[PDB]
Structure formats: C-alpha cells, structure tokens
Design a protein around this ligand. Structure first.
Ligand SMILES: CN1CCC[C@H]1CCO[C@@H](c1cc2nccc(C(=O)O)c2s1)c1ccccc1Cl
Ligand SMILES: [Mn+2]
Length: 302
C-alpha cells in the first residue's frame, strides 16, 4: 500500500578539474546519465554562489494546486483564488503549512514521509489537500538567483567568478541551430509539484536549487519515452486520452509505482540546496518540493 521509492539516479561529485564547464562535463557523463534520464551534480564544496535576487521587491502570485484533482473526477472552479505573496510571506505560509500538517518542525520531517504522503494524497478521495506553487516567475522580473553583470544590481569582486561561471544558468547556450531565452524561477512549498512532461524540442534542462528544503525528482530515460506515453494514454481518463501531448502533459499525474508496474524504468533523487539536476533529451520527469525552497531552471542545447 505504501509508496515504494524508485532506485536513486546517478550523483556526480566532480573535482575542480572535472568542473570546468557543464557542456563538456555533461557530454562525458552522458553514457550513464542518458540511461537514467536525470542525474544530480554536486559542485565542489568551495563553489557557493550568492543569492542575487531582489528580495525586498520580490512579489509573486502563485498558482493553486489541488493534489487529487484527477481522482476527484471520479461549486467547481471557485475553490481558491490566486493571491499575491512576498517571498517572506510565502515562506511563513509554507513553513506553517508543513509544520501543522505533520505536527513536527519542518526540518525534522523525513523526506521519505513527505514522499509517501504526497502520493497518498494524489490518489486520496477523502482528503482534499490544496497547496500553492510560485512557478511562473521569469528571471527578468526580479533578477536571476545568480549574479549577472547586467548593470541593475551591484556585484562584489568575490561574486564576479559566479557571474562569469559556465554553471551560472544565465551563461548556458540556449540557441538551437537551424536554417531559420532566460532562466525561470520556482518558489516551492511542501507538496507543490509538477507532473510528467518532456521539454519543447526535446531539449535538455538544467536546474539549480539556490536554497531551501529539497526538491524530489523522478526521471525516465529517453529509451522508455514511448513506453511511458503508452501507459499514460492507457490509464488516462478517456476525455484526456485523445488530447495532443502538449495539452495532455498539463495533467499527466501518475504515481511512479504505476509506471514501474508497467515496466517503465523510473529513477528518483532528492536535490538539496546548492546541487544541480540535469534532464536529458526526451527524458520524462516529474517531482514535488519537500518544503519552502527556491530553484532556477533553463533549457539548453548542445
Ligand atoms: C515551462 N514554464 C515556464 C515558466 C514556468 C513553467 C510553467 C509550467 O511549469 C512546469 C514545470 C516544469 C518543470 N520542469 C523541471 C522542474 C520543475 C520544478 O518545479 O522544479 C518544473 S515546473 C509544470 C508542468 C506540469 C505541471 C506543473 C508545472 Cl509548474
Ligand atoms: Mn521540465
């Protein structure tokens, strides 16, 4: 009955010589990481970029997420309106929610317990849990989490190495080669989540957790992409089974154990603060946040 955690995805701890640039490093770990869909990269201990967002003016209006909206299928539409938070007020709400839900301090809740409870609530018909996710935040609004030589914020000399680092997500190559843009920010709370999807143009994605509680990931290697899609449309509601992929993946919520029972390989990881997660081309991924955190992500091409 309880959720069975998938096997762990690869974690790489490159030395300073192995940490030269992401594109060269990702190309070398590709033979292994492409067979798991996702991988985690822990930078050297001394690589600690400062948080360079405008915290004083950071204001956002997160989306409302009903965990059991798909199982609730079998007044609607006015359950909770989308409201504005500051970055401080969102953290107070997030910490209060998690501590009250588990009856424990937020830092004492085991990651396995949040994981087991998240997947129970997704399929629960007797308990309706509703959370919020600050998912629509462009780095052009209040600045990137990384220091950027933009001219709209002061950069200290000890922070210039991070403004010029290849692992700064603002310095990733994003232009696709053809005959014929900026990172996004994610302010999470406990149970806020994203369902199974791949990137537009089957692009890579790189994700950095600036601070906060871990972000739990699930990934499927690209060689099983068509197997996952077949399981999805087999078990999806009939009203959504015929929808185009770009629209269907707005509601492709599925317990990883269900995919594993159908033979789909799934890997998991807990991304901690200061760690990177890379998703490979056509690697389906999903996840949820363990608590109040702040992430930055961008799609890149090779
Ligand atoms: C791409 N759109 C640009 C602005 C924000 C974003 C809006 C939608 O967002 C994706 C997400 C994809 C994704 N991929 C990797 C990691 C995370 C994470 O939350 O850490 C996320 S969220 C998503 C997908 C399904 C369900 C919920 C969400 Cl929110
Ligand atoms: Mn994604």
């Amino acid at each position: 009955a309880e959720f069975v955690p998938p096997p762990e995805c690869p974690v790489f701890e490159p030395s300073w010589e192995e940490f030269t640039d992401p594109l060269s490093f990702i190309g070398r770990i590709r033979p292994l990481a492409e067979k798991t869909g996702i991988c985690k990269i822990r930078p050297p201990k001394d690589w600690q970029p400062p948080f360079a967002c405008e915290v004083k003016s950071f204001r956002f209006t997160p989306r409302v997420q009903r965990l059991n909206e798909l199982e609730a299928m079998t007044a609607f539409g006015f359950e909770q309106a989308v409201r504005e938070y500051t970055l401080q007020s969102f953290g107070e709400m997030a910490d209060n929610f998690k501590s009250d839900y588990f009856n424990m301090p937020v830092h004492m809740v085991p990651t396995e317990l949040v994981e087991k409870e998240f997947w129970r609530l997704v399929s629960s018909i007797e308990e309706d849990v509703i959370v919020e996710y600050g998912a629509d935040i462009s780095s052009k609004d209040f600045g990137s989490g990384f220091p950027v030589k933009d001219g709209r914020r002061k950069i200290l000399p000890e922070e210039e190495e991070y403004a010029l680092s290849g692992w700064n997500l603002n310095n990733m190559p994003v232009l696709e080669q053809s005959v014929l843009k900026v990172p996004w920010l994610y302010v999470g709370m406990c149970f806020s989540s994203f369902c199974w999807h791949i990137e537009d143009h089957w692009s890579y994605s790189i994700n950095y957790l600036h601070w906060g509680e871990p972000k739990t990931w699930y990934g499927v290697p690209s060689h099983a992409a068509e197997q996952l899609e077949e399981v999805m449309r087999e078990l999806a509601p009939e009203l959504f089974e015929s929808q185009p992929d770009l629209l269907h993946q707005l509601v492709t919520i599925m317990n990883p154990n269900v995919l594993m029972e159908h033979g789909v390989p799934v890997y998991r990881t807990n991304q901690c603060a200061g760690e990177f997660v890379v998703t490979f081309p056509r690697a389906y991924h999903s996840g949820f946040n363990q608590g109040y955190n702040f992430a930055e992500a961008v799609n890149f091409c090779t």
